[PDB]
Amino acid sequence: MECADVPLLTPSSKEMMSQALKATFSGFTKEQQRLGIPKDPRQWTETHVRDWVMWAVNEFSLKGVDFQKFCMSGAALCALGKECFLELAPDFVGDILWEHLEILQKEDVK
């Protein structure tokens, strides 16, 4: 068990979000509060969802997201589920966003 610098998985596809996303999540969620944007997703507007949508995206330079495919009100954002969301973006980006989607809600995940 390496505790100094813990090795995870093969840094090709997902390891990027593993280190980058899970750490960076505090970024939007911090200004989310500032923007008066509710911490959870299931009550967002199309604006709030897309804000957070393009955030994990713009961080990763996933900036080829179809904002129209990403037209979710927060309840819709939630309603899609992983299945839909990841088909709703590139399979990495959907889960990238889906992670933070889950992360926003993980602040109250039970």
Side-chain angles (χ1 to χ4, degrees):
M1 180 183 180
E2 308 303 277
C3 294
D5 288 276
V6 59
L8 300 174
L9 296 177
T10 49
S12 51
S13 309
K14 188 144 298 190
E15 193 58 67
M16 284 60 266
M17 77 123 65
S18 174
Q19 54 181 329
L21 260 192
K22 310 304 294 282
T24 197
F25 285 145
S26 35
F28 180 84
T29 304
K30 179 179 180 295
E31 124 151 301
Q32 196 174 330
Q33 299 302 271
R34 194 282 294 200
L35 293 164
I37 301 185
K39 38 137 293 212
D40 242 88
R42 13 263 187 126
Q43 78 299 266
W44 276 349
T45 57
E46 301 80 86
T47 6
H48 291 154
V49 169
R50 282 180 294 185
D51 261 300
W52 152 91
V53 148
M54 64 185 310
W55 175 85
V57 155
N58 93 146
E59 166 70 279
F60 267 98
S61 298
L62 320 173
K63 309 189 75 187
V65 124
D66 189 76
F67 301 100
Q68 292 297 270
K69 220 290 184 55
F70 272 93
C71 285
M72 279 83 60
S73 310
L77 181 64
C78 182
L80 41 69
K82 116 82 224 301
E83 318 301 270
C84 185
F85 204 110
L86 320 207
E87 297 195 283
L88 150 139
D91 293 78
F92 183 36
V93 178
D95 179 82
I96 274 175
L97 270 172
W98 173 252
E99 259 292 68
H100 198 188
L101 184 33
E102 197 188 284
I103 274 53
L104 312 140
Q105 88 210 214
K106 119 244 183 62
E107 285 290 274
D108 209 301
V109 63
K110 283 170 271 60

